[PDB]
């Protein structure tokens, strides 16, 4: 089997963590990401071509550039910022709205679970607006991209949703 | 298509370079954009998505002597020689991929745009042992 993902999200959500923790199986001290990594993980018979594109403000008009081809979508969201799910919101919407990423399946990371008070898996499905989203293929997963929980759980939804 | 050039404004550097193909060693005419840590080429100064994305990782630039070509620098990484540069590029289908080159080879109009491309993309290189790290790691596992 094979899947391209592409996995966004602001800045310091957690992505290239998620990204590395799927290809070496370790947690890395990670540095904000410029361009994009890319990299392609075997999970359970399924390869995925995974692309972790920087979220800084300034790289954000260029996530367009990656839609073509995309089959997953991978949002990962820092679930202990309530300042920025506002913002989160708005830029999921731009994505999955786009015509070129109608047909992509979407994985919700709510990522940085450990962290006290951190939103829930129900508390982000209300704040990034997926309740009113009833005709697209959507699930959030909780995760905590250090440990790895909930990361195969993630990829395992995307597996059985994918068609 | 998609106007992403908000991503463009106000560069460290941009102009036109020769350069040279990954696996198929063919040279194109590029409109190349140094900004944000990345270096960016174009097919025309029209277009509005880049043609190729070179995310400028603990790489180095050094001078070389082309038999046809003037004014040659090249990309690369000195602490791993021989392994694959990460880049993208745009296939006709507007579908991104991942680069193939070992090194960038590059030719610059006149010497002196070759002597202001260096210094400008030295200056550029995000430098971090992140890179190394990842690199490193990737290689001790690879099947
Ligand atoms: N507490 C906690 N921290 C996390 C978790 N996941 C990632 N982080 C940390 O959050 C910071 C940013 O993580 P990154 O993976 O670099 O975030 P990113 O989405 O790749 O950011 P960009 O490269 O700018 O797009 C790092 O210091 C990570 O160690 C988590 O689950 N819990
Ligand atoms: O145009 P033709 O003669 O077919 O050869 C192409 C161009 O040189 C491409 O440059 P550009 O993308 O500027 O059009 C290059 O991609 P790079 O941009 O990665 O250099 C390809 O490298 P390989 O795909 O590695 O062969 C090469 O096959
Ligand atoms: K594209
Ligand atoms: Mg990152």
Redesign the interface.
């Known amino acids: 089997g094979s899947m391209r993902i592409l996995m966004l999200g602001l800045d310091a959500a957690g992505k290239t963590t998620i990204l ?1 923790k799927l ?2 199986g ?1 947690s ?4 904000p990401t ?5 990299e392609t993980v075997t999970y359970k018979n399924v390869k995925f071509n995974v ?1 972790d594109v920087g979220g800084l403000d ?2 954000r ?2 996530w ?3 839609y ?2 995309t089959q997953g979508l991978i949002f990962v969201v820092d679930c202990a910022d309530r300042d920025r799910i506002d913002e989160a919101r708005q830029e999921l919407h731009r994505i999955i709205n786009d015509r070129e990423m109608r047909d992509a399946i979407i994985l919700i990371f709510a990522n940085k679970q450990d962290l006290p008070d951190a939103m829930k898996p129900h508390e982000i499905q209300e704040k990034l607006g997926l309740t009113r989203i009833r005709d697209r293929n959507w699930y959030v997963q909780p995760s905590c991209a250090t440990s790895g929980d909930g990361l195969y759980e993630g990829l395992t939804w995307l597996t059985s949703n994918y068609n | 298509g998609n106007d992403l050039t908000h991503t463009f404004f106000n560069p460290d550097r941009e102009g036109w370079l020769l350069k040279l193909g990954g696996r198929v060693k063919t040279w194109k005419r590029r409109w190349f954009i140094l900004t944000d840590n990345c270096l960016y080429y174009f097919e025309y100064t029209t277009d509005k998505e880049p043609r190729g994305i070179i995310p400028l990782e603990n790489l180095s630039i050094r001078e070389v002597e082309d038999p046809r070509k003037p004014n040659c620098f090249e990309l690369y990484n000195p602490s791993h020689k021989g392994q694959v540069i990460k880049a993208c590029k745009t296939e006709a289908d507007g579908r991104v991929v991942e680069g193939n080159h070992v090194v960038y080879r590059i030719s610059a109009p006149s010497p002196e745009e070759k002597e202001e491309w260096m210094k400008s993309i030295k200056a550029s290189i995000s430098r971090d042992p992140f890179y190394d790290m990842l690199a490193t790691r990737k290689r001790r596992i690879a099947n």
């Open positions: 590395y290809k070496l370790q890395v001290t990670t540095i410029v361009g994009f990594n890319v692309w300034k790289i008009p260029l367009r550039h990656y073509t081809g």
